[PDB]
């Protein structure tokens, strides 16, 4: 569970999107595990516009924030699940750290703002769906 609220937008994991999210759809990318829906209320999360590779993420399965070094967004293979078949997920960043099913949605932040949200995990690794390239979220 977890979303980013910037302007009139809500950024969630596509596999966790609700009926309301789909009925108020703006953009969705299955390959990125991302969905953006429209909100009535105005959001105040600052999206980072950078090439930072160090940050801090929220881990609900531990109730702790964790500093991580993370990779640059890229096509990483992700194993089959009840939401998607085996495939390469684009714009994915990996870090050594704890992630469990229930942790998707946790925000990764650097000094510049929100970088992305927890999207994958397992094997002592955590994967983040990057949002920095989505410049339309600001306007």
Ligand X SMILES: C[C@H](C(=O)N1CCC[C@H](C(N)=O)C1)c1cccs1
Detail the residues annotated as belonging to a binding site for Zn(2+): 50, 52, 110, 112
First to last CA, the chain: 26
- Which 3 state secondary structure label does DSSP give 28? strand
Judged by beta carbon distances under 5 to 8 A according to partner kind, the member of Zn ion, ligand X, none in contact with residue 37 is none
Using the rule CB under 5 A, which residue among 5, 8, 39, 52 binds Zn ion? Answer: 52
Single out the segment in contact with ligand X by CB under 6 A; choices: 35-43, 52-60, 69-77, 79-87: 79-87
Backbone φ and ψ of 121, nearest 5° = -160, -150
CA distance 125 to 29: 23
Half-sphere exposure at residue 48, Cβ-oriented, CA atoms within 13 angstroms = 19
* Least distance to ligand X, CB of residue 107, Å: 14
* Least distance to Zn ion, CB of residue 82, Å: 34
Residue number, nearest CB to ligand X:
121
Catalytic annotation, residues: 15, 33, 104
Provide the CA 97 distance to its chain's centre, in angstroms. 15
* Least distance to ligand X, CB of residue 85, Å: 10
Judged by beta carbon distances under 5 to 8 A according to partner kind, the member of ligand X, Zn ion, none in contact with residue 110 is Zn ion
Cβ atoms of 66 and 59 closer than 8 Å: yes
Site residues for Zn ion, 92-111, by CB under 5 A, read: 110
Q: Give residue for tokens 């955590």.
A: 126
Give, as one character, the DSSP assignment of residue 26.
E
Tell me which residues touch ligand X (CB under 6 A): 15, 33, 78, 81, 83-84, 89, 99-101, 103-104, 119-122
């Amino acid at each position: 569970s977890g979303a980013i609220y910037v302007g009139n937008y809500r950024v969630v994991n596509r596999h966790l999107a609700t009926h309301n999210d789909w009925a108020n759809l703006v953009w969705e990318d299955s390959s990125r595990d991302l969905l953006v829906s429209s909100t009535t209320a105005q959001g105040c999360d600052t999206i980072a516009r950078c090439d930072c590779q160090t940050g801090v993420y929220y881990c609900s399965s531990r109730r702790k924030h964790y500093p991580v070094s993370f990779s640059k967004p890229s096509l990483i293979f992700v194993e089959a699940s009840e939401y998607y078949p085996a495939r390469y997920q684009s714009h994915l960043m990996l870090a050594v750290g704890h992630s469990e099913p229930g942790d998707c949605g946790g925000i990764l932040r650097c000094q510049h703002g929100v970088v992305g949200i927890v999207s994958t995990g397992g094997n002592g690794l955590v994967g983040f769906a990057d949002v920095r390239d989505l410049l339309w979220l600001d306007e």
